[PDB]
Design a protein around this ligand. Structure first.
Ligand SMILES: *[C@@H]1O[C@H](CO)[C@@H](O[C@@H]2O[C@H](CO)[C@@H](O)[C@H](O)[C@H]2NC(C)=O)[C@H](O)[C@H]1NC(C)=O
Ligand SMILES: *[C@@H]1O[C@H](CO[C@@H]2O[C@@H](C)[C@@H](O)[C@@H](O)[C@@H]2O)[C@@H](O)[C@H](O)[C@H]1NC(C)=O
Ligand SMILES: *[C@@H]1O[C@H](CO)[C@@H](O)[C@H](O)[C@H]1NC(C)=O
Ligand SMILES: *[C@@H]1O[C@H](CO)[C@@H](O)[C@H](O)[C@H]1NC(C)=O
Lengths: 407, 416, 406
């Protein structure tokens, strides 16, 4: 149930650390552009009206002789744009009226009739598909529509959205945002070498960002599902930025970004800070010729996934290694066998480390990992910064998702 | 106005530190790890009230009769009346479903139906659907309105005081009548594998919940589904099927008192789970940073000693220095409210900021020329001073609490 | 594009330290708290209302000398009385409102007489709110606005009524309780400058940039970051009225709401100051051991926030301090090729940051471990890192949504 970063390999090529070497975790370039991210669905946008037209007829049938035969019927007809709009704005003003049936217009030797045009406005809220950029309600033709004048199944009723003006069918309302782009000044701009930043995003990977069209504008979906508005005009390294990214798979869904996101960015920034002054605190200790504890060794290593360094103590000689860090899941802080599930917390138990050195009376692996008669014990700083890394993740995918409506 | 966590007694039984184990407080529930076991269950927590859910309609039935009176002779005597009746279920379902489609129409009064030597009349059945939004009582599980019979109702076909009106909720399908919307959540359960499972030996964790005590958790039924209320007012749904250690879980917990209310779980909650973990960590290395000093035979400062001690309420350790021997003591920590960082008398308000300033400590040892109490508290000629780490970290522990009860509460409506 | 806390002057008068005093950034302060209320965000159900339209539906019976019964139907749009609408309003709320249509016919001889029904129409109509100027806003209103529960419209026969007539001064957004603490010098006369505002959502708000603002009908104070709390003239601090100590806010000033997401700031700042202190003490300890200081060891010692503090260096092996006021500067990167930073604003004014350089290892060293090496001018990593946090804490303070009126 624990998460950790561990060198992927079970053996490393160790090399003694040279005197007065002090490496605790370039040609950077940052460009910022103006952007827009969604706050959450506001249903006030998918409000609408059911426009219903019918003719209320009073026919006066008058033949050879006899009384005045008078009838009342109702003809459901489909209204025109001007028929609805007129009766609509009267609804907006409280002047909408149902006048009822006509007075009698009677005559001789012909069956003729006089009719009234009565338009009905009933308020009606619908659903939205923000991705597919059109409205959705079962009363619609097919269950969806992308027009300002939507046809319904009933021959005589059409639907009008609360606001006829705005030309994009969208559920969520948005907020502006300044998204930063960090890349290598030296190499060609490429989707891979880019890390995205903002005040709500610490280190969002360009390698795993994909182009997604959302609420009628192109934009890009971050690794955790959050999305920013982005058009083909915004250039990075004087090259168009938008095209660099593959398109997102079908049924890819987007999350809203709350103010609650900044809370991660802060604690990541501190964990890096706490961590850094903590490995120095371990080098100061080395420098003083004070022997290193398994706790001390865990201070020195990288603790996040990616190419990094590991350290150990081989016959009093501080040794290090290059290696790539990946995320593993250990069963607890002390294992009976040095095994971890390398690809999923229900994955298989493979050996994580097998190369064991001498350490007094017990043995010691990479970054302060122990092999003791009491089992294989980890360092607590590693476990702990893994518990943070965990919470730090789940909080990123903790936002509300935009689920479209299905016709 | 300042708080710290402090040993409950004013005196402790001190014992010298004997064996060299760097016995540091490892923030969170890692204290009892000689057999901790975690099982997680899938669950649901409230987001906050959504008013859309209490939308509804007032169904009004009426008979519009056109009477044709025709006696011995004379003109066609016609009168118009309207007879208000209570609608039937299918009547409402129809006139409502006519409304959702804009098909509902008021035909008005009937055409004239006349005859001889008898007064006969013709009627229309006119139903009106006028929109009416009501309030909800989520704990007790029913609607609430002044127009209701008794001031509340718990069915999808509610009667009103006026005999000719009934109330229907916008969505007739959903049986639980609940005001706020939910989101899913995965709650972890931690327990000692050795002991019998019980509410006492259980700690609840999630991504919004750092260490919730099972002993201070109680069963509360909410919005038509069983569940448990954590101390901070937040609530997670838990039904009786869920087993921990092959035993029913929900039953382990007592029922929450009447008029106990629940807070929503906003996402802003993670920030507590995060900065709690950071302090649990920082305090660890700081405790070590001092054990290293102990290692090196460097004399310990009053700050050094607060580094060694527990800083959260509950059974922990205290350290002091008895004539050059670093000594520890067992004690349970409580939260106190000191007036400031440096006091004129060793007195603090235990368990409440509006409490009795009582003496916090009385067992004072010699410390160069001044005296020193537990976990680096000094008795000096300048007054009684705390260490600043303890003070600052009480400031954190505080807003962690103060932020824990910071979510909105589900206040039901009280009828009539 | 980076921000840091750096001493304002380019050179200071340093005095060697021999005091054995551990002056780390953590007198006669006194704290008094008052109870208050702040906006959480706009609620749209709060702006709901109704259209009352009164009209007379007349049935006239014209009957002259002779001939058939001539009957006509008309509708006269009329303006309703306050008490007339209320009749149809609670009648609307009960589903009992009815458009009865045209009256039965009342006919007679040698005179034209008519029978009429008073049909009131209630059309639901959602409107806008101006929380600042404290009145509703709509184009249908006379002039486009109104401040009463019975509002006139452009159309002579329509008035607008809000769902709840019991108006608290008509406010679009809803509020919450909050406990605001005031920190001041007990010693000095109380003044707008000497006050710092705290709460569980506000860590150290400067009272000097706070200004009195009236909002949704409650007098109050607008914090520097746009957030606002309700505050009355009754609340006294140091036995003096608090609300009046503060200037009035500029015209068209708008407020942002205060979310729980704020607590996230107040938290990391409390951890920072906890870490810094523990790290700087952790340095004094090093000096106790007479281990030479690294520029890092030195950056642990300095103030990290704008204001009167201390800066440090090491002059000919002697650890030295100086008094100075800290400001926020914007350096181009973590190591510059010229000792230049932009003082008081990120837009322009590239000034020399430091000029007083002492000998160090083989290289020269400025304040708080700033190095002048052949590779450029390197800042410590801690100082840079703490400037990155101190920054986002800023962009996150202003990260809440603000109230735009119509
Ligand atoms: C650390 O200690 C081992 C055990 O002493 C070292 O192994 C060497 O083994 C060779 C071959 O028998 C001998 O020269 C000595 O026994 C050891 N050499 C020295 C210089 O002491 C080796 O240095 C280290 N082992 C590992 C795995 O790093
Ligand atoms: C200093 O403290 C001593 C503590 O009492 C005991 O004596 C020592 C030698 C150990 O046996 C220890 O475990 C005991 O607690 C006092 O005996 C001594 O008198 C004190 N000296 C002073 C006050 O000058
Ligand atoms: C209200 O309800 C009844 C129908 O049950 C209706 O006939 C009458 O108007 C009212 N009841 C009585 C007792 O008058
Ligand atoms: C309001 O009333 C009359 C008719 O009721 C309308 O024609 C006009 O807009 C207003 N009155 C005047 C005198 O302009």
């Amino acid at each position: 149930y624990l998460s950790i970063a561990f060198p992927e390999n079970t053996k490393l090529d160790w090399k003694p650390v040279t005197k007065n070497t002090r490496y605790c975790p370039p040609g950077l370039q940052e460009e910022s552009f103006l952007s827009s991210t969604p706050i959450g669905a506001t249903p006030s946008k998918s409000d609408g009206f059911l426009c219903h037209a019918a003719k209320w007829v009073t026919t006066c049938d008058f033949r050879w002789y006899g009384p005045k035969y008078i009838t009342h019927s109702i003809h459901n007809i489909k209204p025109t744009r001007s028929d609805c709009d007129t009766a609509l704005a009267s609804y907006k003003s409280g002047t909408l009226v149902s006048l009822g049936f006509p007075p009698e217009s009677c005559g001789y030797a012909s069956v003729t009739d006089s009719e009234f045009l009565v338009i009905m406005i009933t308020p009606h809220h619908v659903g939205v598909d923000d991705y597919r950029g059109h409205w959705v309600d079962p009363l619609f033709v097919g269950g969806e529509c992308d027009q300002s004048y939507c046809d319904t199944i009933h021959n005589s009723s059409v639907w009008i959205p609360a606001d006829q003006t705005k030309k994009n069918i969208c559920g969520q309302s948005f907020t502006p945002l300044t998204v930063t782009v960090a890349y290598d000044k030296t190499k060609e701009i490429a989707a891979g070498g880019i890390v995205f930043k903002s005040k709500y995003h610490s280190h969002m990977e360009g390698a795993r960002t994909c182009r997604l069209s959302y609420c009628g504008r192109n934009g890009i979906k971050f690794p955790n599902g959050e999305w920013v508005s982005l058009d083909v005009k915004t250039r990075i390294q004087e090259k168009h930025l938008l095209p660099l990214f593959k398109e997102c798979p079908a049924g890819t869904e987007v999350r809203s970004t709350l103010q609650s996101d900044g809370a991660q960015v802060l604690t990541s920034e501190i964990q890096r800070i706490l961590d850094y002054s903590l490995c120095q605190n371990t080098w100061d200790k080395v420098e003083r010729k004070e022997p290193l504890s398994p706790l001390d060794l865990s201070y020195l290593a990288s603790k996040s996934p990616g190419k990094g360094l590991a350290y150990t103590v081989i016959n009093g000689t501080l040794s290090f290694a290059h290696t790539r860090y990946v995320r593993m899941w250990i069963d607890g802080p002390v294992l009976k066998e040095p095994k971890g599930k390398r690809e999923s917390p229900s994955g298989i138990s493979s050996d994580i480390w097998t190369q064991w050195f001498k350490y007094g009376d017990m043995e010691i692996g990479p970054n302060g990992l122990l092999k003791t008669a009491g089992g294989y014990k980890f360092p607590w700083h590693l476990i702990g910064m893994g518990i943070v890394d965990n919470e730090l993740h789940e909080l990123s995918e903790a936002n509300p998702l935009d689920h479209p409506q299905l016709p």
